[PDB]
Design a protein around this ligand. Structure first.
Ligand SMILES: [Cl-]
Ligand SMILES: [Cl-]
Ligand SMILES: [Cl-]
Ligand SMILES: [Cl-]
Ligand SMILES: [Cl-]
Ligand SMILES: [Cl-]
Ligand SMILES: [Zn+2]
Ligand SMILES: [Zn+2]
Length: 270
Protein backbone atom coordinates (compact mmCIF):
# COMPACT_ATOMS: atom_id res chain seq x y z
CA UNK A 1 0.00 0.00 0.00
CA UNK A 2 1.66 3.22 -1.26
CA UNK A 3 0.31 6.51 -2.69
CA UNK A 4 1.33 6.35 -6.39
CA UNK A 5 4.07 8.70 -7.72
CA UNK A 6 3.66 9.92 -11.36
CA UNK A 7 5.83 12.61 -13.05
CA UNK A 8 4.14 14.68 -15.82
CA UNK A 9 3.97 13.11 -19.29
CA UNK A 10 6.17 14.77 -22.01
CA UNK A 11 9.18 16.06 -19.95
CA UNK A 12 12.02 17.82 -21.91
CA UNK A 13 14.79 15.56 -23.30
CA UNK A 14 17.60 17.63 -21.65
CA UNK A 15 16.21 16.92 -18.12
CA UNK A 16 17.10 13.18 -18.07
CA UNK A 17 20.01 13.58 -20.53
CA UNK A 18 23.48 12.80 -19.05
CA UNK A 19 26.14 15.49 -18.58
CA UNK A 20 29.79 14.94 -17.64
CA UNK A 21 30.53 16.27 -14.09
CA UNK A 22 33.01 19.18 -13.63
CA UNK A 23 34.63 21.45 -11.00
CA UNK A 24 32.91 24.87 -10.89
CA UNK A 25 35.12 26.71 -8.32
CA UNK A 26 37.13 25.47 -5.35
CA UNK A 27 35.14 22.68 -3.67
CA UNK A 28 31.95 23.22 -5.73
CA UNK A 29 31.20 20.66 -8.45
CA UNK A 30 28.39 20.27 -11.00
CA UNK A 31 26.92 16.71 -10.70
CA UNK A 32 23.53 17.41 -12.39
CA UNK A 33 22.06 16.28 -15.71
CA UNK A 34 22.20 18.20 -19.03
CA UNK A 35 19.67 20.79 -17.77
CA UNK A 36 18.85 19.85 -14.16
CA UNK A 37 21.58 21.37 -12.03
CA UNK A 38 22.74 19.39 -8.98
CA UNK A 39 25.59 20.85 -6.90
CA UNK A 40 28.14 18.97 -4.80
CA UNK A 41 30.17 20.70 -2.04
CA UNK A 42 33.04 18.50 -0.84
CA UNK A 43 34.27 19.12 2.75
CA UNK A 44 36.79 17.62 5.20
CA UNK A 45 33.87 16.34 7.41
CA UNK A 46 31.59 15.14 4.54
CA UNK A 47 29.56 16.33 1.51
CA UNK A 48 26.58 18.57 0.75
CA UNK A 49 24.26 18.03 -2.19
CA UNK A 50 22.03 20.91 -3.46
CA UNK A 51 19.20 19.72 -5.86
CA UNK A 52 18.55 16.23 -7.37
CA UNK A 53 16.83 16.27 -10.82
CA UNK A 54 13.82 13.94 -11.63
CA UNK A 55 13.39 10.31 -10.33
CA UNK A 56 15.55 8.93 -13.19
CA UNK A 57 18.38 11.43 -12.33
CA UNK A 58 19.28 9.24 -9.26
CA UNK A 59 21.62 6.75 -11.13
CA UNK A 60 23.09 9.74 -13.14
CA UNK A 61 23.96 11.91 -10.07
CA UNK A 62 25.35 8.85 -8.25
CA UNK A 63 27.50 8.02 -11.34
CA UNK A 64 28.64 11.69 -11.72
CA UNK A 65 29.68 11.81 -8.00
CA UNK A 66 31.77 8.59 -8.52
CA UNK A 67 33.33 9.98 -11.80
CA UNK A 68 34.84 12.96 -9.90
CA UNK A 69 36.37 10.54 -7.34
CA UNK A 70 33.83 11.23 -4.54
CA UNK A 71 31.55 8.98 -2.48
CA UNK A 72 27.78 9.77 -2.46
CA UNK A 73 27.60 7.75 0.86
CA UNK A 74 29.50 10.75 2.38
CA UNK A 75 26.67 13.22 1.61
CA UNK A 76 25.92 14.53 5.11
CA UNK A 77 23.37 17.27 4.08
CA UNK A 78 20.70 17.52 1.34
CA UNK A 79 19.55 21.06 0.24
CA UNK A 80 16.92 22.51 -2.18
CA UNK A 81 16.46 25.68 -4.24
CA UNK A 82 12.75 24.92 -5.05
CA UNK A 83 10.16 22.15 -4.20
CA UNK A 84 9.39 20.92 -7.75
CA UNK A 85 9.82 17.25 -8.95
CA UNK A 86 12.62 18.33 -11.37
CA UNK A 87 14.85 19.21 -8.31
CA UNK A 88 13.26 16.87 -5.65
CA UNK A 89 12.66 13.62 -7.61
CA UNK A 90 15.75 11.76 -6.25
CA UNK A 91 15.58 13.33 -2.74
CA UNK A 92 13.97 10.33 -1.01
CA UNK A 93 16.25 7.92 -2.94
CA UNK A 94 19.25 9.91 -1.58
CA UNK A 95 17.87 10.25 2.00
CA UNK A 96 17.31 6.44 2.35
CA UNK A 97 20.53 5.25 0.62
CA UNK A 98 22.87 7.69 2.46
CA UNK A 99 21.12 8.52 5.81
CA UNK A 100 21.94 12.22 5.15
CA UNK A 101 19.98 14.96 6.90
CA UNK A 102 17.51 17.00 4.81
CA UNK A 103 17.22 20.76 5.56
CA UNK A 104 14.62 22.88 3.71
CA UNK A 105 13.00 26.38 3.58
CA UNK A 106 10.14 26.40 6.12
CA UNK A 107 7.63 27.62 3.48
CA UNK A 108 8.07 24.45 1.30
CA UNK A 109 7.57 21.82 4.08
CA UNK A 110 3.96 20.76 3.15
CA UNK A 111 4.82 20.40 -0.59
CA UNK A 112 7.65 18.00 0.40
CA UNK A 113 5.65 15.92 2.91
CA UNK A 114 2.77 15.54 0.35
CA UNK A 115 5.08 14.82 -2.62
CA UNK A 116 3.68 17.77 -4.56
CA UNK A 117 -0.05 17.52 -3.68
CA UNK A 118 -0.05 20.86 -1.79
CA UNK A 119 1.76 22.82 -4.58
CA UNK A 120 -0.28 25.93 -5.68
CA UNK A 121 0.44 24.95 -9.29
CA UNK A 122 2.02 21.44 -9.36
CA UNK A 123 -0.71 19.96 -7.09
CA UNK A 124 -3.05 19.53 -10.13
CA UNK A 125 -0.67 16.62 -11.11
CA UNK A 126 -1.08 14.91 -7.69
CA UNK A 127 2.10 13.16 -6.41
CA UNK A 128 4.93 14.14 -8.83
CA UNK A 129 7.77 12.97 -6.55
CA UNK A 130 8.38 10.59 -3.59
CA UNK A 131 7.39 12.60 -0.48
CA UNK A 132 10.24 13.47 1.96
CA UNK A 133 10.28 14.62 5.66
CA UNK A 134 12.82 17.40 6.51
CA UNK A 135 15.07 16.88 9.56
CA UNK A 136 15.31 20.70 9.96
CA UNK A 137 13.50 23.83 8.70
CA UNK A 138 15.30 26.97 7.57
CA UNK A 139 14.37 30.67 7.53
CA UNK A 140 16.08 33.56 5.72
CA UNK A 141 19.77 34.10 6.68
CA UNK A 142 20.06 30.71 8.46
CA UNK A 143 23.58 29.24 8.40
CA UNK A 144 24.31 25.58 7.37
CA UNK A 145 27.77 24.42 8.51
CA UNK A 146 29.88 21.33 7.59
CA UNK A 147 33.65 21.58 7.96
CA UNK A 148 35.03 25.07 7.15
CA UNK A 149 32.18 25.55 4.58
CA UNK A 150 29.28 27.83 5.70
CA UNK A 151 26.18 28.27 3.51
CA UNK A 152 23.59 31.01 4.03
CA UNK A 153 20.01 30.40 2.92
CA UNK A 154 18.54 33.38 1.05
CA UNK A 155 14.71 33.20 1.04
CA UNK A 156 13.67 33.96 -2.59
CA UNK A 157 9.92 33.01 -2.81
CA UNK A 158 7.53 33.11 -5.77
CA UNK A 159 8.55 30.22 -8.01
CA UNK A 160 7.58 28.04 -4.99
CA UNK A 161 6.46 29.37 -1.54
CA UNK A 162 9.93 28.47 -0.20
CA UNK A 163 12.22 28.80 -3.22
CA UNK A 164 15.67 29.95 -2.10
CA UNK A 165 19.26 30.60 -3.12
CA UNK A 166 22.50 29.84 -1.29
CA UNK A 167 25.55 32.02 -0.75
CA UNK A 168 28.93 30.74 0.42
CA UNK A 169 32.68 31.18 0.06
CA UNK A 170 34.96 28.47 -1.38
CA UNK A 171 38.64 28.44 -2.24
CA UNK A 172 41.15 26.96 -4.62
CA UNK A 173 44.99 27.23 -4.62
CA UNK A 174 44.67 30.70 -6.28
CA UNK A 175 41.83 32.61 -4.42
CA UNK A 176 38.51 32.70 -2.46
CA UNK A 177 35.12 32.93 -4.30
CA UNK A 178 31.75 34.18 -3.03
CA UNK A 179 29.43 31.70 -4.78
CA UNK A 180 25.69 32.30 -5.36
CA UNK A 181 23.47 29.31 -6.25
CA UNK A 182 20.41 31.19 -7.55
CA UNK A 183 16.78 30.17 -7.99
CA UNK A 184 15.72 32.57 -10.80
CA UNK A 185 12.32 34.18 -10.06
CA UNK A 186 10.23 32.99 -13.06
CA UNK A 187 6.35 32.88 -13.14
CA UNK A 188 4.73 29.39 -13.67
CA UNK A 189 1.04 30.53 -13.39
CA UNK A 190 -0.88 31.51 -16.56
CA UNK A 191 -3.77 33.12 -14.54
CA UNK A 192 -3.88 36.49 -12.55
CA UNK A 193 -2.11 36.46 -9.13
CA UNK A 194 -5.47 37.48 -7.56
CA UNK A 195 -7.00 34.19 -8.85
CA UNK A 196 -4.15 32.16 -7.16
CA UNK A 197 -6.05 31.73 -3.86
CA UNK A 198 -3.78 28.73 -2.98
CA UNK A 199 -0.80 31.16 -2.66
CA UNK A 200 -2.18 34.38 -1.07
CA UNK A 201 1.22 36.17 -0.88
CA UNK A 202 2.43 35.22 -4.49
CA UNK A 203 2.62 38.79 -5.87
CA UNK A 204 4.22 40.37 -2.77
CA UNK A 205 6.66 37.39 -2.46
CA UNK A 206 8.09 37.87 -6.04
CA UNK A 207 8.17 41.67 -5.38
CA UNK A 208 10.40 41.13 -2.30
CA UNK A 209 12.50 38.49 -4.26
CA UNK A 210 13.32 40.98 -7.07
CA UNK A 211 14.34 43.61 -4.52
CA UNK A 212 16.64 41.35 -2.46
CA UNK A 213 18.17 39.58 -5.55
CA UNK A 214 19.33 42.89 -7.22
CA UNK A 215 21.34 43.82 -4.03
CA UNK A 216 23.37 40.55 -3.78
CA UNK A 217 27.22 40.56 -3.81
CA UNK A 218 29.00 37.46 -5.23
CA UNK A 219 31.99 36.46 -7.39
CA UNK A 220 30.38 33.44 -9.08
CA UNK A 221 26.73 32.68 -9.95
CA UNK A 222 24.91 29.49 -11.12
CA UNK A 223 21.18 28.51 -11.17
CA UNK A 224 18.58 25.58 -10.85
CA UNK A 225 18.68 25.02 -14.67
CA UNK A 226 21.83 24.90 -16.90
CA UNK A 227 20.17 27.09 -19.60
CA UNK A 228 19.71 29.98 -17.05
CA UNK A 229 23.45 30.52 -16.61
CA UNK A 230 24.13 29.49 -20.27
CA UNK A 231 26.32 26.49 -19.29
CA UNK A 232 26.33 24.91 -22.79
CA UNK A 233 27.19 28.22 -24.52
CA UNK A 234 30.08 28.84 -22.03
CA UNK A 235 31.58 25.31 -22.18
CA UNK A 236 31.60 21.88 -23.84
CA UNK A 237 32.10 18.64 -21.86
CA UNK A 238 35.76 17.91 -21.12
CA UNK A 239 36.72 21.66 -20.93
CA UNK A 240 39.31 22.38 -18.16
CA UNK A 241 38.74 24.07 -14.77
CA UNK A 242 37.70 27.70 -15.55
CA UNK A 243 35.75 29.55 -12.75
CA UNK A 244 35.80 32.83 -14.87
CA UNK A 245 33.06 31.35 -17.09
CA UNK A 246 30.69 31.80 -14.09
CA UNK A 247 31.84 35.36 -13.23
CA UNK A 248 29.50 37.01 -15.74
CA UNK A 249 27.80 39.20 -13.08
CA UNK A 250 26.15 41.49 -15.70
CA UNK A 251 24.29 38.48 -17.21
CA UNK A 252 22.81 37.67 -13.75
CA UNK A 253 21.44 41.25 -13.51
CA UNK A 254 20.21 41.28 -17.15
CA UNK A 255 18.28 37.97 -16.64
CA UNK A 256 16.98 39.23 -13.26
CA UNK A 257 15.73 42.50 -14.85
CA UNK A 258 14.09 40.54 -17.73
CA UNK A 259 12.26 38.45 -15.10
CA UNK A 260 11.12 41.66 -13.23
CA UNK A 261 10.06 43.28 -16.60
CA UNK A 262 7.74 40.32 -17.34
CA UNK A 263 6.67 40.11 -13.64
CA UNK A 264 5.50 43.78 -13.71
CA UNK A 265 3.91 43.27 -17.15
CA UNK A 266 1.88 40.42 -15.60
CA UNK A 267 0.74 42.53 -12.55
CA UNK A 268 -0.54 45.42 -14.76
CA UNK A 269 -3.36 43.04 -15.93
CA UNK A 270 -4.46 43.06 -12.15
CL1 LIG B 1 -2.99 6.71 -5.15
CL1 LIG C 1 -4.43 14.27 -0.07
CL1 LIG D 1 -2.82 28.75 -14.23
CL1 LIG E 1 -5.55 35.59 -3.15
CL1 LIG F 1 9.10 37.81 3.15
CL1 LIG G 1 22.84 27.15 -22.60
ZN1 LIG H 1 10.25 24.89 -10.82
ZN1 LIG I 1 13.07 23.53 -12.41
Amino acid sequence: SAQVVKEPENMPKEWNQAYEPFRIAGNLYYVGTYDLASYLIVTDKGNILINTGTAESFPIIKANIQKLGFNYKDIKILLLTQAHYDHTGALQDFKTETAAKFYVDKADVDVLRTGGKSDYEMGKYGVTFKPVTPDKTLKDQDKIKLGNITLTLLHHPGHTKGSCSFIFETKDEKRKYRVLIANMPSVIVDKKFSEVTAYPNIQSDYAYTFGVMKKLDFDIWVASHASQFDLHEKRKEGDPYNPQLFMDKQSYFQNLNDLEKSYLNKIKKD
